[PDB]
Amino acid sequence: GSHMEDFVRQCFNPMIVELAEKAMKEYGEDPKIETNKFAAICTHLEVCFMYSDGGSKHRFEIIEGRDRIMAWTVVNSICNTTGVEKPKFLPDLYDYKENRFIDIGVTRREVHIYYLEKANKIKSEKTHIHIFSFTGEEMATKADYTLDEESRARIKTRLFTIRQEMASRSLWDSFRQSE
Ligand SMILES: O=C(NCCOc1ccccc1)c1nc([C@@H]2CCCN2C(=O)CCc2ccccc2Cl)[nH]c(=O)c1O
Ligand SMILES: [Mn+2]
Ligand SMILES: [Mn+2]
């Protein structure tokens, strides 16, 4: 019964918490034990949702937060109708405006490092990458940040708020060192 599990539950909204614990279940991890990862997935989820709200009405298709079969199902439907490369790994969103998949990263480390690590792993030329940090830095593929500045700023604000809430509860160091 960790302080972190209770913090997560009153910091993120119940829909986010539900989706996160389900995602961990499907991959056989326990939110009760792997608490830092629990917080990370909720954070990643909330960022993806704020991101998808950033655009026009139906600009983004949300792939993160689905179960794996349905997520892949939507990917092939997008691919088989837009003639776009089928990625090796599940992206987080699809941008109908820019006709590309997006994987969103959230890191406690330096954004350059995390970006470099992600590009190698995804091993998809076409997948756009957009990294946010808890300190307010962002790095996006080809310097193309997709959204306007204000949508990205509220994401960065929320991320820094989470960091303060954690640190005020002494969970930040453990969370920072866990990545
Ligand atoms: O979609 C992603 N992974 C597919 C699902 O993998 C799970 C694996 C275990 C449980 C539940 C799910 C994804 N993974 C990652 C990173 C590096 C690769 C593995 N990883 C993580 O396990 C970190 C925690 C995480 C899990 C899921 C979603 C977001 C995060 Cl942060 N970073 C993304 O930005 C991203 O989108
Ligand atoms: Mn994802
Ligand atoms: Mn992601």
Side-chain angles (χ1 to χ4, degrees), residues 1-21 23-56 58-67 69-84 86-87 89-108 110-115 118-119 124 127-136 138 140-141 143-148 150-176 178-179:
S2 60
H3 191 344
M4 173 68 89
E5 189 202 325
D6 293 339
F7 165 75
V8 165
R9 287 188 188 277
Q10 213 68 248
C11 183
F12 296 88
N13 77 53
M15 195 259 302
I16 294 268
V17 169
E18 260 187 342
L19 284 172
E21 50 194 357
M24 280 174 90
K25 305 292 192 177
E26 174 175 0
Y27 292 71
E29 321 221 12
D30 199 3
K32 304 264 162 192
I33 297 105
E34 301 219 46
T35 60
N36 292 305
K37 215 191 275 184
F38 188 27
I41 286 146
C42 291
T43 302
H44 183 263
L45 257 169
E46 183 166 18
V47 166
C48 290
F49 287 164
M50 295 171 79
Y51 203 104
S52 65
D53 179 316
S56 317
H58 289 303
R59 168 166 189 180
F60 299 103
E61 190 77 78
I62 304 169
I63 295 126
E64 180 57 76
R66 302 189 186 260
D67 59 76
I69 297 99
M70 190 60 178
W72 279 112
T73 309
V74 182
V75 164
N76 320 114
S77 304
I78 290 169
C79 289
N80 273 277
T81 48
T82 68
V84 171
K86 171 161 163 177
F89 295 84
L90 275 176
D92 295 320
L93 311 162
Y94 181 75
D95 185 338
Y96 281 113
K97 191 180 162 161
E98 301 278 3
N99 277 127
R100 62 204 186 197
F101 290 98
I102 305 175
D103 192 333
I104 301 206
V106 177
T107 176
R108 301 145 258 193
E110 167 134 49
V111 312
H112 322 98
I113 309 293
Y114 186 39
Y115 187 120
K118 167 159 273 147
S124 294
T127 297
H128 207 79
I129 288 163
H130 198 140
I131 303 303
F132 300 86
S133 87
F134 285 85
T135 63
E138 71 192 318
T141 298
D144 183 343
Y145 295 93
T146 301
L147 308 173
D148 61 3
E150 314 78 315
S151 302
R152 282 136 59 206
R154 51 188 307 266
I155 289 185
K156 293 163 173 169
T157 295
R158 175 63 177 151
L159 288 180
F160 199 87
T161 294
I162 291 165
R163 173 219 190 102
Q164 297 186 253
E165 289 308 284
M166 282 186 181
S168 147
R169 289 159 170 88
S170 300
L171 325 173
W172 174 249
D173 280 324
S174 169
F175 189 63
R176 193 182 217 155
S178 172
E179 153 160 40

